[PDB]
Amino acid sequence: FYTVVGVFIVVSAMSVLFWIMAPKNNQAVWRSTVILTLAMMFLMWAITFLCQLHPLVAPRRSDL
Amino acid sequence: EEAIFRSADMTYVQLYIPLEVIREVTFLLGKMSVFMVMDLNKDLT
Amino acid sequence: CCTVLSAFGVVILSVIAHLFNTNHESFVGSINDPEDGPAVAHTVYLAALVYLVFFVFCGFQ
């Protein structure tokens, strides 16, 4: 689970570093598109990583 | 400013157009595209 | 519109023929899958060439 927190640190620090270094021309759509898309990419990565970190169902097939 | 997070700041100004320069001011405001008129005489038919 | 379908017929069937040639387990790895890899790759690569003929002929239209 700590390799989810370790990715949350480098995503959150990147989003904070982009909040202060956004271009001044279109600030409320530079720091709103890029910071929210990193959040949603990290959310789907964390959900697709934690479902396989400690699984309850093993993959079972016959034809191999 | 930009107005993509909230709306822009509106003012409700009041003009006074004389009858000598009336068509010219109206055709100027039609080309400037900044003044949203409001129907003052709603009670008239 | 045949040139778009023909360009995808080049790309997708070339990747499928390469994945049959290298015995990739998403195409050969099951019992219901075909047994010989390059035997299927030889008849998918010729279809890739056929769609390349369609792409070149409809590319001059």
Short mmCIF file of N, CA and C in Angstrom, two decimals:
data_model
loop_
_atom_site.label_atom_id
_atom_site.label_comp_id
_atom_site.label_asym_id
_atom_site.label_seq_id
_atom_site.Cartn_x
_atom_site.Cartn_y
_atom_site.Cartn_z
N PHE A 1 0.83 -1.20 0.00
CA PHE A 1 0.00 0.00 0.00
C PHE A 1 0.87 1.25 0.00
N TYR A 2 2.09 1.13 0.50
CA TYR A 2 2.98 2.29 0.55
C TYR A 2 3.53 2.68 -0.81
N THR A 3 3.42 1.81 -1.81
CA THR A 3 3.69 2.17 -3.19
C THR A 3 2.48 2.80 -3.88
N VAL A 4 1.40 3.03 -3.14
CA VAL A 4 0.35 3.94 -3.56
C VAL A 4 0.54 5.32 -2.94
N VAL A 5 0.97 5.35 -1.68
CA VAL A 5 1.29 6.61 -1.01
C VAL A 5 2.53 7.25 -1.65
N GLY A 6 3.50 6.43 -2.06
CA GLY A 6 4.68 6.96 -2.72
C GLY A 6 4.41 7.53 -4.09
N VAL A 7 3.34 7.07 -4.75
CA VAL A 7 2.92 7.67 -6.01
C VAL A 7 2.03 8.88 -5.75
N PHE A 8 1.26 8.86 -4.65
CA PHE A 8 0.47 10.03 -4.27
C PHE A 8 1.34 11.22 -3.92
N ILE A 9 2.52 10.97 -3.34
CA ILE A 9 3.44 12.06 -3.01
C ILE A 9 3.96 12.72 -4.28
N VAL A 10 4.39 11.93 -5.26
CA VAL A 10 4.95 12.52 -6.48
C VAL A 10 3.88 13.03 -7.44
N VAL A 11 2.61 12.65 -7.25
CA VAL A 11 1.54 13.29 -8.02
C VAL A 11 1.09 14.58 -7.34
N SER A 12 0.98 14.57 -6.01
CA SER A 12 0.51 15.75 -5.29
C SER A 12 1.54 16.87 -5.31
N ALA A 13 2.83 16.52 -5.21
CA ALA A 13 3.88 17.52 -5.31
C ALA A 13 3.95 18.12 -6.71
N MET A 14 3.70 17.29 -7.73
CA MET A 14 3.66 17.78 -9.11
C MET A 14 2.47 18.71 -9.33
N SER A 15 1.32 18.39 -8.73
CA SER A 15 0.14 19.23 -8.89
C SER A 15 0.29 20.55 -8.13
N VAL A 16 0.94 20.53 -6.97
CA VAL A 16 1.22 21.77 -6.24
C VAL A 16 2.26 22.60 -6.97
N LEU A 17 3.24 21.95 -7.60
CA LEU A 17 4.24 22.68 -8.37
C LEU A 17 3.66 23.23 -9.67
N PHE A 18 2.56 22.65 -10.15
CA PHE A 18 1.91 23.21 -11.33
C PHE A 18 0.89 24.28 -10.95
N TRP A 19 0.35 24.24 -9.73
CA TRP A 19 -0.56 25.29 -9.27
C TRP A 19 0.14 26.65 -9.20
N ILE A 20 1.42 26.66 -8.85
CA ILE A 20 2.17 27.91 -8.74
C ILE A 20 2.91 28.27 -10.03
N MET A 21 3.05 27.33 -10.97
CA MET A 21 3.77 27.58 -12.21
C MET A 21 2.84 27.48 -13.42
N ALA A 22 1.55 27.72 -13.21
CA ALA A 22 0.61 27.73 -14.32
C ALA A 22 0.80 29.01 -15.14
N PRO A 23 0.54 28.96 -16.45
CA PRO A 23 0.65 30.17 -17.28
C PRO A 23 -0.43 31.18 -16.94
N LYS A 24 -0.06 32.46 -16.97
CA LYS A 24 -0.93 33.53 -16.50
C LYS A 24 -2.05 33.84 -17.48
N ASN A 25 -1.96 33.34 -18.72
CA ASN A 25 -2.94 33.68 -19.75
C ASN A 25 -4.30 33.04 -19.45
N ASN A 26 -4.31 31.77 -19.08
CA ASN A 26 -5.54 31.01 -18.88
C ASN A 26 -5.47 30.19 -17.60
N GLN A 27 -5.14 30.86 -16.48
CA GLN A 27 -4.86 30.20 -15.20
C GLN A 27 -5.96 29.26 -14.74
N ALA A 28 -7.21 29.72 -14.76
CA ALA A 28 -8.29 28.89 -14.23
C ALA A 28 -8.70 27.75 -15.16
N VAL A 29 -8.02 27.55 -16.29
CA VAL A 29 -8.18 26.33 -17.07
C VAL A 29 -6.86 25.59 -17.26
N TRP A 30 -5.71 26.21 -16.99
CA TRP A 30 -4.48 25.43 -16.93
C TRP A 30 -4.40 24.64 -15.63
N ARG A 31 -4.61 25.30 -14.49
CA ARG A 31 -4.47 24.61 -13.21
C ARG A 31 -5.76 23.91 -12.82
N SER A 32 -6.77 23.96 -13.69
CA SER A 32 -7.98 23.18 -13.43
C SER A 32 -8.02 21.92 -14.29
N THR A 33 -7.53 22.00 -15.53
CA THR A 33 -7.49 20.79 -16.35
C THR A 33 -6.38 19.85 -15.89
N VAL A 34 -5.17 20.37 -15.70
CA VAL A 34 -4.01 19.52 -15.49
C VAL A 34 -4.01 18.94 -14.08
N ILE A 35 -4.47 19.71 -13.10
CA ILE A 35 -4.45 19.22 -11.72
C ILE A 35 -5.58 18.21 -11.49
N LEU A 36 -6.71 18.38 -12.18
CA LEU A 36 -7.80 17.43 -12.01
C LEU A 36 -7.54 16.14 -12.79
N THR A 37 -6.84 16.24 -13.94
CA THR A 37 -6.58 15.03 -14.71
C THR A 37 -5.52 14.16 -14.05
N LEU A 38 -4.57 14.77 -13.33
CA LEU A 38 -3.61 13.98 -12.56
C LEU A 38 -4.30 13.29 -11.40
N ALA A 39 -5.29 13.96 -10.80
CA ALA A 39 -6.07 13.36 -9.73
C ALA A 39 -6.87 12.16 -10.22
N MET A 40 -7.49 12.27 -11.40
CA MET A 40 -8.32 11.17 -11.87
C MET A 40 -7.48 10.02 -12.43
N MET A 41 -6.33 10.33 -13.05
CA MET A 41 -5.40 9.28 -13.45
C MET A 41 -4.84 8.54 -12.25
N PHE A 42 -4.49 9.27 -11.18
CA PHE A 42 -4.02 8.60 -9.97
C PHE A 42 -5.13 7.80 -9.30
N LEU A 43 -6.38 8.29 -9.36
CA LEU A 43 -7.48 7.56 -8.74
C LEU A 43 -7.74 6.24 -9.46
N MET A 44 -7.77 6.25 -10.80
CA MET A 44 -7.97 4.97 -11.48
C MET A 44 -6.75 4.07 -11.37
N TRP A 45 -5.54 4.63 -11.30
CA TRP A 45 -4.37 3.78 -11.06
C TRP A 45 -4.40 3.15 -9.67
N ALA A 46 -4.79 3.91 -8.65
CA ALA A 46 -4.83 3.38 -7.30
C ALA A 46 -5.92 2.34 -7.14
N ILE A 47 -7.06 2.55 -7.81
CA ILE A 47 -8.13 1.56 -7.76
C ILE A 47 -7.74 0.29 -8.52
N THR A 48 -7.06 0.43 -9.67
CA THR A 48 -6.66 -0.77 -10.39
C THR A 48 -5.42 -1.44 -9.80
N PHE A 49 -4.72 -0.77 -8.89
CA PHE A 49 -3.59 -1.38 -8.20
C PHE A 49 -4.00 -2.05 -6.90
N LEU A 50 -4.93 -1.45 -6.15
CA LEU A 50 -5.33 -2.01 -4.87
C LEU A 50 -6.26 -3.21 -5.01
N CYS A 51 -6.93 -3.37 -6.15
CA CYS A 51 -7.75 -4.56 -6.36
C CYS A 51 -6.90 -5.79 -6.61
N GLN A 52 -5.62 -5.62 -6.92
CA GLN A 52 -4.70 -6.72 -7.18
C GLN A 52 -3.59 -6.81 -6.16
N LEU A 53 -3.59 -5.95 -5.15
CA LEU A 53 -2.54 -5.98 -4.14
C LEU A 53 -2.71 -7.19 -3.23
N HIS A 54 -3.93 -7.43 -2.76
CA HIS A 54 -4.27 -8.60 -1.95
C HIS A 54 -5.57 -9.18 -2.48
N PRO A 55 -5.50 -9.99 -3.54
CA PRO A 55 -6.73 -10.49 -4.15
C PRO A 55 -7.30 -11.68 -3.41
N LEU A 56 -8.63 -11.81 -3.48
CA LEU A 56 -9.33 -12.93 -2.89
C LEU A 56 -9.65 -14.02 -3.90
N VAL A 57 -9.68 -13.69 -5.19
CA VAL A 57 -10.02 -14.62 -6.25
C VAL A 57 -8.76 -14.86 -7.07
N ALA A 58 -8.43 -16.14 -7.30
CA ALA A 58 -7.31 -16.51 -8.15
C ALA A 58 -7.79 -16.74 -9.58
N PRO A 59 -6.97 -16.42 -10.58
CA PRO A 59 -7.38 -16.69 -11.96
C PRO A 59 -7.36 -18.18 -12.27
N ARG A 60 -8.46 -18.66 -12.83
CA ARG A 60 -8.69 -20.08 -13.03
C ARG A 60 -9.15 -20.31 -14.45
N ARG A 61 -8.41 -21.12 -15.20
CA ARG A 61 -8.79 -21.45 -16.57
C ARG A 61 -8.46 -22.91 -16.85
N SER A 62 -9.12 -23.45 -17.87
CA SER A 62 -8.94 -24.84 -18.27
C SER A 62 -8.05 -24.99 -19.49
N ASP A 63 -8.30 -24.20 -20.53
CA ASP A 63 -7.58 -24.31 -21.79
C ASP A 63 -6.26 -23.52 -21.72
N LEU A 64 -5.15 -24.25 -21.64
CA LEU A 64 -3.84 -23.62 -21.68
C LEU A 64 -2.83 -24.61 -22.25
N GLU B 1 -9.36 40.40 -16.75
CA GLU B 1 -9.64 39.13 -16.09
C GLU B 1 -10.17 38.10 -17.08
N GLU B 2 -10.22 36.85 -16.64
CA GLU B 2 -10.97 35.81 -17.31
C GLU B 2 -12.14 35.40 -16.44
N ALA B 3 -13.15 34.80 -17.06
CA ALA B 3 -14.41 34.51 -16.40
C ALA B 3 -14.85 33.09 -16.68
N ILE B 4 -13.94 32.13 -16.50
CA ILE B 4 -14.28 30.74 -16.78
C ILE B 4 -14.57 30.01 -15.48
N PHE B 5 -14.15 30.58 -14.35
CA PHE B 5 -14.49 29.98 -13.06
C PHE B 5 -15.80 30.53 -12.52
N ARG B 6 -15.98 31.85 -12.60
CA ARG B 6 -17.25 32.49 -12.27
C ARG B 6 -17.60 33.42 -13.42
N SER B 7 -18.75 34.08 -13.31
CA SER B 7 -19.19 34.96 -14.38
C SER B 7 -18.42 36.27 -14.37
N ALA B 8 -18.56 37.03 -15.45
CA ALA B 8 -17.94 38.34 -15.55
C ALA B 8 -18.75 39.37 -14.76
N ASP B 9 -18.13 40.53 -14.52
CA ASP B 9 -18.71 41.53 -13.64
C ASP B 9 -19.54 42.53 -14.44
N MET B 10 -20.86 42.47 -14.29
CA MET B 10 -21.79 43.32 -15.02
C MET B 10 -22.15 44.56 -14.20
N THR B 11 -22.57 45.62 -14.90
CA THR B 11 -22.65 46.94 -14.27
C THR B 11 -24.00 47.66 -14.33
N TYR B 12 -24.80 47.41 -15.38
CA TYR B 12 -26.09 48.08 -15.65
C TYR B 12 -25.90 49.60 -15.78
N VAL B 13 -25.24 49.98 -16.87
CA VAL B 13 -25.03 51.39 -17.16
C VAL B 13 -26.29 52.00 -17.75
N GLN B 14 -26.33 53.33 -17.83
CA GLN B 14 -27.47 54.08 -18.33
C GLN B 14 -26.97 55.13 -19.31
N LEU B 15 -27.36 55.01 -20.57
CA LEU B 15 -27.00 56.00 -21.57
C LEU B 15 -28.10 57.04 -21.72
N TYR B 16 -27.77 58.14 -22.39
CA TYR B 16 -28.76 59.14 -22.78
C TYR B 16 -28.39 59.59 -24.19
N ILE B 17 -29.13 59.10 -25.18
CA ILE B 17 -28.84 59.36 -26.58
C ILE B 17 -29.76 60.49 -27.05
N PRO B 18 -29.22 61.61 -27.54
CA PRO B 18 -30.08 62.65 -28.12
C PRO B 18 -30.66 62.24 -29.47
N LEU B 19 -31.61 63.01 -29.99
CA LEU B 19 -32.25 62.67 -31.26
C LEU B 19 -31.42 63.09 -32.47
N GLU B 20 -30.38 63.89 -32.27
CA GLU B 20 -29.57 64.31 -33.41
C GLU B 20 -28.60 63.21 -33.83
N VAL B 21 -28.11 62.43 -32.87
CA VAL B 21 -27.05 61.46 -33.09
C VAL B 21 -27.53 60.03 -32.84
N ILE B 22 -28.82 59.78 -33.04
CA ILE B 22 -29.46 58.59 -32.48
C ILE B 22 -29.14 57.33 -33.30
N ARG B 23 -29.24 57.43 -34.63
CA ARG B 23 -28.96 56.30 -35.50
C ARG B 23 -27.48 55.95 -35.48
N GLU B 24 -26.63 56.97 -35.37
CA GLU B 24 -25.19 56.77 -35.34
C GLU B 24 -24.73 56.07 -34.06
N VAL B 25 -25.30 56.46 -32.91
CA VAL B 25 -24.97 55.79 -31.66
C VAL B 25 -25.51 54.36 -31.64
N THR B 26 -26.69 54.15 -32.22
CA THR B 26 -27.25 52.80 -32.24
C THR B 26 -26.45 51.86 -33.16
N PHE B 27 -26.06 52.34 -34.34
CA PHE B 27 -25.17 51.56 -35.20
C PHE B 27 -23.75 51.44 -34.66
N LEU B 28 -23.32 52.33 -33.77
CA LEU B 28 -22.04 52.12 -33.10
C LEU B 28 -22.14 51.01 -32.06
N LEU B 29 -23.18 51.03 -31.23
CA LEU B 29 -23.40 49.98 -30.24
C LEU B 29 -23.67 48.63 -30.88
N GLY B 30 -24.24 48.60 -32.09
CA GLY B 30 -24.37 47.35 -32.81
C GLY B 30 -23.06 46.76 -33.28
N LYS B 31 -22.06 47.60 -33.54
CA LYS B 31 -20.75 47.11 -33.96
C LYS B 31 -19.82 46.83 -32.79
N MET B 32 -20.05 47.47 -31.64
CA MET B 32 -19.18 47.22 -30.49
C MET B 32 -19.49 45.89 -29.81
N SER B 33 -20.77 45.48 -29.83
CA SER B 33 -21.23 44.16 -29.35
C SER B 33 -20.96 43.95 -27.87
N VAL B 34 -21.10 45.02 -27.08
CA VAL B 34 -20.82 44.95 -25.65
C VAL B 34 -22.02 45.32 -24.78
N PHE B 35 -23.09 45.88 -25.33
CA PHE B 35 -24.16 46.47 -24.54
C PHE B 35 -25.43 45.64 -24.72
N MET B 36 -25.86 44.97 -23.65
CA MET B 36 -27.05 44.13 -23.67
C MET B 36 -28.23 44.96 -23.17
N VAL B 37 -29.10 45.35 -24.10
CA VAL B 37 -30.21 46.25 -23.79
C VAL B 37 -31.27 45.52 -22.97
N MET B 38 -32.06 46.30 -22.23
CA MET B 38 -33.18 45.79 -21.46
C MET B 38 -34.42 46.60 -21.80
N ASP B 39 -35.54 45.91 -21.99
CA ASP B 39 -36.79 46.54 -22.40
C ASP B 39 -37.36 47.31 -21.23
N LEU B 40 -37.24 48.64 -21.28
CA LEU B 40 -37.73 49.48 -20.19
C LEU B 40 -39.24 49.62 -20.23
N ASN B 41 -39.81 49.77 -21.42
CA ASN B 41 -41.25 50.00 -21.56
C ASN B 41 -41.97 48.67 -21.83
N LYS B 42 -41.99 47.84 -20.79
CA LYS B 42 -42.70 46.57 -20.86
C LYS B 42 -44.21 46.76 -20.80
N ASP B 43 -44.68 47.82 -20.14
CA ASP B 43 -46.11 48.03 -19.98
C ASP B 43 -46.78 48.52 -21.26
N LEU B 44 -46.02 49.04 -22.22
CA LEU B 44 -46.60 49.42 -23.49
C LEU B 44 -46.94 48.19 -24.32
N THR B 45 -47.92 48.35 -25.20
CA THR B 45 -48.43 47.25 -26.01
C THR B 45 -47.54 47.04 -27.23
N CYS C 1 -13.82 5.81 -48.77
CA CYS C 1 -13.68 5.31 -47.40
C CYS C 1 -12.92 4.00 -47.37
N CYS C 2 -12.65 3.44 -48.55
CA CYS C 2 -11.93 2.18 -48.63
C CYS C 2 -10.46 2.34 -48.29
N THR C 3 -9.90 3.54 -48.45
CA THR C 3 -8.50 3.76 -48.10
C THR C 3 -8.27 3.77 -46.59
N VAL C 4 -9.24 4.21 -45.80
CA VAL C 4 -9.13 4.17 -44.34
C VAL C 4 -9.18 2.74 -43.83
N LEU C 5 -10.17 1.98 -44.30
CA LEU C 5 -10.29 0.56 -43.97
C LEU C 5 -9.07 -0.22 -44.44
N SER C 6 -8.50 0.17 -45.58
CA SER C 6 -7.30 -0.49 -46.08
C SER C 6 -6.05 -0.14 -45.28
N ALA C 7 -5.93 1.09 -44.79
CA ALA C 7 -4.80 1.45 -43.94
C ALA C 7 -4.87 0.72 -42.60
N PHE C 8 -6.06 0.65 -42.00
CA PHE C 8 -6.23 -0.18 -40.80
C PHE C 8 -6.02 -1.66 -41.11
N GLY C 9 -6.35 -2.10 -42.32
CA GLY C 9 -6.08 -3.47 -42.71
C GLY C 9 -4.61 -3.77 -42.88
N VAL C 10 -3.82 -2.77 -43.26
CA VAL C 10 -2.37 -2.94 -43.22
C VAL C 10 -1.89 -3.07 -41.78
N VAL C 11 -2.24 -2.09 -40.94
CA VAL C 11 -1.63 -1.96 -39.62
C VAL C 11 -2.06 -3.10 -38.69
N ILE C 12 -3.37 -3.31 -38.55
CA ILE C 12 -3.89 -4.29 -37.60
C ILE C 12 -3.50 -5.71 -38.00
N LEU C 13 -3.64 -6.05 -39.29
CA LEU C 13 -3.29 -7.40 -39.72
C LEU C 13 -1.79 -7.63 -39.73
N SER C 14 -0.97 -6.59 -39.93
CA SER C 14 0.47 -6.76 -39.77
C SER C 14 0.86 -7.03 -38.33
N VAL C 15 0.23 -6.33 -37.37
CA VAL C 15 0.51 -6.60 -35.96
C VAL C 15 0.01 -7.99 -35.56
N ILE C 16 -1.14 -8.42 -36.08
CA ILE C 16 -1.67 -9.75 -35.78
C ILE C 16 -0.77 -10.84 -36.37
N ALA C 17 -0.26 -10.62 -37.59
CA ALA C 17 0.65 -11.59 -38.19
C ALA C 17 1.98 -11.66 -37.45
N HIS C 18 2.46 -10.52 -36.93
CA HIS C 18 3.68 -10.55 -36.12
C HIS C 18 3.45 -11.24 -34.78
N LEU C 19 2.27 -11.08 -34.19
CA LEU C 19 1.97 -11.76 -32.94
C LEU C 19 1.69 -13.24 -33.11
N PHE C 20 1.25 -13.67 -34.30
CA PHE C 20 1.23 -15.10 -34.59
C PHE C 20 2.62 -15.65 -34.89
N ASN C 21 3.50 -14.83 -35.48
CA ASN C 21 4.83 -15.32 -35.84
C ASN C 21 5.69 -15.54 -34.60
N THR C 22 5.58 -14.67 -33.61
CA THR C 22 6.40 -14.77 -32.41
C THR C 22 5.78 -15.63 -31.32
N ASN C 23 4.67 -16.32 -31.62
CA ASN C 23 3.97 -17.23 -30.69
C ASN C 23 3.52 -16.51 -29.42
N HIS C 24 2.83 -15.39 -29.60
CA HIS C 24 2.32 -14.62 -28.48
C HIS C 24 1.14 -15.35 -27.85
N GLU C 25 1.10 -15.37 -26.52
CA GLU C 25 0.16 -16.22 -25.80
C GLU C 25 -1.27 -15.67 -25.77
N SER C 26 -1.51 -14.47 -26.28
CA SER C 26 -2.87 -13.98 -26.44
C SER C 26 -3.50 -14.43 -27.75
N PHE C 27 -2.77 -15.17 -28.58
CA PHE C 27 -3.26 -15.66 -29.85
C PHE C 27 -3.04 -17.15 -30.08
N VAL C 28 -2.05 -17.76 -29.43
CA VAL C 28 -1.70 -19.16 -29.68
C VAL C 28 -1.86 -19.93 -28.38
N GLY C 29 -1.80 -19.22 -27.25
CA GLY C 29 -1.59 -19.80 -25.93
C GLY C 29 -2.72 -20.67 -25.40
N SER C 30 -3.88 -20.70 -26.05
CA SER C 30 -4.99 -21.53 -25.59
C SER C 30 -5.11 -22.79 -26.43
N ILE C 31 -5.88 -23.75 -25.90
CA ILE C 31 -6.12 -25.00 -26.61
C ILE C 31 -7.00 -24.77 -27.83
N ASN C 32 -7.99 -23.88 -27.70
CA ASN C 32 -8.87 -23.56 -28.83
C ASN C 32 -8.18 -22.69 -29.87
N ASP C 33 -7.04 -22.09 -29.53
CA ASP C 33 -6.26 -21.32 -30.49
C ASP C 33 -5.60 -22.26 -31.51
N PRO C 34 -5.23 -21.74 -32.68
CA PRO C 34 -4.49 -22.57 -33.65
C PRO C 34 -3.13 -23.00 -33.13
N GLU C 35 -2.70 -24.17 -33.59
CA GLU C 35 -1.48 -24.79 -33.07
C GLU C 35 -0.23 -24.15 -33.65
N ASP C 36 -0.17 -24.03 -34.98
CA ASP C 36 1.02 -23.52 -35.65
C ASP C 36 0.90 -22.01 -35.81
N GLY C 37 1.87 -21.29 -35.26
CA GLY C 37 1.92 -19.85 -35.34
C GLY C 37 2.21 -19.28 -36.72
N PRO C 38 3.39 -19.56 -37.28
CA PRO C 38 3.73 -19.04 -38.62
C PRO C 38 2.83 -19.54 -39.75
N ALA C 39 2.12 -20.66 -39.57
CA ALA C 39 1.15 -21.08 -40.58
C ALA C 39 -0.04 -20.12 -40.65
N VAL C 40 -0.41 -19.53 -39.51
CA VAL C 40 -1.46 -18.51 -39.51
C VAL C 40 -0.87 -17.16 -39.90
N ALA C 41 0.38 -16.89 -39.51
CA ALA C 41 1.04 -15.65 -39.89
C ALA C 41 1.24 -15.53 -41.40
N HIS C 42 1.47 -16.66 -42.08
CA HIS C 42 1.66 -16.64 -43.53
C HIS C 42 0.38 -16.29 -44.28
N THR C 43 -0.80 -16.60 -43.72
CA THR C 43 -2.04 -16.25 -44.38
C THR C 43 -2.67 -14.97 -43.85
N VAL C 44 -2.15 -14.42 -42.75
CA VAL C 44 -2.56 -13.08 -42.33
C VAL C 44 -1.68 -12.01 -42.98
N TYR C 45 -0.39 -12.31 -43.19
CA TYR C 45 0.51 -11.36 -43.83
C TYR C 45 0.17 -11.17 -45.31
N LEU C 46 -0.31 -12.21 -45.98
CA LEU C 46 -0.78 -12.04 -47.36
C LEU C 46 -2.03 -11.19 -47.42
N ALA C 47 -2.91 -11.28 -46.41
CA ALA C 47 -4.06 -10.39 -46.36
C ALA C 47 -3.65 -8.95 -46.07
N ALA C 48 -2.59 -8.77 -45.28
CA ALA C 48 -2.01 -7.44 -45.09
C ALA C 48 -1.48 -6.87 -46.40
N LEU C 49 -0.82 -7.70 -47.22
CA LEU C 49 -0.42 -7.27 -48.55
C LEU C 49 -1.60 -6.98 -49.48
N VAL C 50 -2.69 -7.73 -49.37
CA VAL C 50 -3.88 -7.47 -50.19
C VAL C 50 -4.50 -6.12 -49.82
N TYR C 51 -4.64 -5.85 -48.52
CA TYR C 51 -5.10 -4.54 -48.09
C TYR C 51 -4.11 -3.43 -48.40
N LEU C 52 -2.81 -3.73 -48.50
CA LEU C 52 -1.86 -2.72 -48.96
C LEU C 52 -2.05 -2.41 -50.44
N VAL C 53 -2.40 -3.42 -51.24
CA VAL C 53 -2.74 -3.19 -52.64
C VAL C 53 -3.99 -2.32 -52.75
N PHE C 54 -5.00 -2.59 -51.92
CA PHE C 54 -6.19 -1.73 -51.89
C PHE C 54 -5.87 -0.32 -51.39
N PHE C 55 -4.90 -0.17 -50.48
CA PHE C 55 -4.55 1.15 -49.97
C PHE C 55 -3.76 1.96 -51.00
N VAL C 56 -2.89 1.30 -51.76
CA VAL C 56 -2.14 2.00 -52.80
C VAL C 56 -3.04 2.36 -53.97
N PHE C 57 -3.95 1.45 -54.36
CA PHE C 57 -4.83 1.73 -55.49
C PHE C 57 -5.85 2.82 -55.16
N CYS C 58 -6.42 2.79 -53.96
CA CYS C 58 -7.34 3.84 -53.55
C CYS C 58 -6.63 5.07 -52.99
N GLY C 59 -5.31 5.02 -52.86
CA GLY C 59 -4.55 6.20 -52.48
C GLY C 59 -4.26 7.15 -53.63
N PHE C 60 -4.46 6.69 -54.86
CA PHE C 60 -4.36 7.53 -56.05
C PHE C 60 -5.74 7.89 -56.60
N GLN C 61 -6.71 8.09 -55.72
CA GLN C 61 -8.06 8.43 -56.15
C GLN C 61 -8.47 9.81 -55.64
#
